């Protein structure tokens, strides 16, 4: 078994044995500045990379993961060719790198486009919640309607209607828009049309926030409570239970397989078991009320009346990091792989280096990447991605930042 040298040059050896895919499979674990290397080892080594479309194959593994790569593929053409010489591929790699470098660049100083959407109406002057897309925006106005905007020429696709109060919170889905309102109700709307499916009574004061995903919804209210519903259909929806422990309005609720996190103006974030709906902890520490969380895997990020953004570990419940810089109430906030984007009362939105922030070696002052100021009133909601922020605010505008 064990008697044959430094011998084997595997990748010239294998094709010569019938077995190309193996040598290709081996090379395929390589990064580019290194696949470059294999390319240049010897002529056959070269050949295996060319005949195995090892760029195609390495660029299709990029897309199949790194958020950014799936992105640039979807946008601006080139993803057109995936899933044909092989050089087109190798030659393209440096440009996709340069892209990512210029985005992550101008996007840390100034990558504007805004595209103001002015909405109108009597009553209001506020877009409370918004949820966003590759070709539509679902927005809960204060006029009591949800307005749906075409993402391209920005026109208004559908004015949905039949809510007593301002639409305070909402969730897309690929079946049903759901909203919570000043009128103490939660609503189900078919996402294609504008048709109300179900409407839940249950609460007794402004449904302030809902979060939604999979078979169950979580919901919360000025009435101090959270309700957990397992939904069997838009038509169905049953109250699993009600969580009582907060001492004031529950401003924000959110959700993953292992925990349900809520926050109120009682200055606490409470963490509930997603399956037993029991208390587990309190995240105490904000000096004033919490206006906004997000929660993903390990992390929970909150915005406060005390003007700071806090960063928590969900398990021990420690605060990892305090973010100062907002000069007014932090009304809305979102994580992501590499950033935290928050919206304040003076209509300013701030971009934070998430990865820097999660490392205590990084000093307070340089955690806020350049700060963005294109709103007249309060910033109510935002949701972003690899290349876009798209924000609501008082001054009844949706902004689409690049």
């Amino acid at each position: 078994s064990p008697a044959i040298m430094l011998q084997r040059d595997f990748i010239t050896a294998l094709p010569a044995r019938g077995l190309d895919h193996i040598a290709e499979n081996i090379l395929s674990y390589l990064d580019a500045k290194s696949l470059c290397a294999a390319e240049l080892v010897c002529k056959e080594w070269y050949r295996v990379t060319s005949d195995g479309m090892l760029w195609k194959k390495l660029i299709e593994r990029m897309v199949r993961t790194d958020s950014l790569w799936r992105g640039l593929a979807e946008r601006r053409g080139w993803g057109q060719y995936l899933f044909p010489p092989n050089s087109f591929y190798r030659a393209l790699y440096p440009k996709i790198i340069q892209d990512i470098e210029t985005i992550e660049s101008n996007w840390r100083c100034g990558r504007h486009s805004l595209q103001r959407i002015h909405c109108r109406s009597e009553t209001s002057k506020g877009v409370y919640c918004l949820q966003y897309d590759d070709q539509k925006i679902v927005s809960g106005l204060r006029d009591n309607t949800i307005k749906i905007w075409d993402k391209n020429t920005l026109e208004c696709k559908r004015i949905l209607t039949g809510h007593t109060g301002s639409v305070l919170c909402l969730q897309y889905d690929e079946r049903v828009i759901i909203t919570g309102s000043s009128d103490s109700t939660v609503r189900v709307w078919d996402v294609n049309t504008g048709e109300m499916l179900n409407t839940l009574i249950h609460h007794c004061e402004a449904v302030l926030h809902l979060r939604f995903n999979n078979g169950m919804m979580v919901t919360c209210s000025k009435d101090r409570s959270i309700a957990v519903w397992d939904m069997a259909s838009p038509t169905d929806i049953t109250l699993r239970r009600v969580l009582v422990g907060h001492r004031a309005a529950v401003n924000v609720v959110d959700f993953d397989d292992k925990y349900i996190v809520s926050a109120s103006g009682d200055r606490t974030i409470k963490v509930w078991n997603t399956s037993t709906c029991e208390f587990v902890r309190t995240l105490n520490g904000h000096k004033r009320g919490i206006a906004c969380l997000q929660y993903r895997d390990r992390l929970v990020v909150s915005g406060s009346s005390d003007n700071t953004i806090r960063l928590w570990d969900i398990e021990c419940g420690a605060c990892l990091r305090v973010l100062e810089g907002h000069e007014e109430l932090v009304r809305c906030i979102r994580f992501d792989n590499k950033r935290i984007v928050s919206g304040a009362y003076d209509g300013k939105i701030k971009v934070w280096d998430l990865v820097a922030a999660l490392d205590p070696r990084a000093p307070a002052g340089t955690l806020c990447l350049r700060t963005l100021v294109e709103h007249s009133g309060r910033v109510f909601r935002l949701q972003f991605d690899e290349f876009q922020i798209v924000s609501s605010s008082h001054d009844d505008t949706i902004l689409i930042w690049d």
Binding site: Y128, C169, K222, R247, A248, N251, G265, G289, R378
Partner: peptide, 11 residues
Amino acid sequence: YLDSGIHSGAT
């Protein structure tokens, strides 16, 4: 006006 959608503490 605060927001109809957020409320601080106590009552």
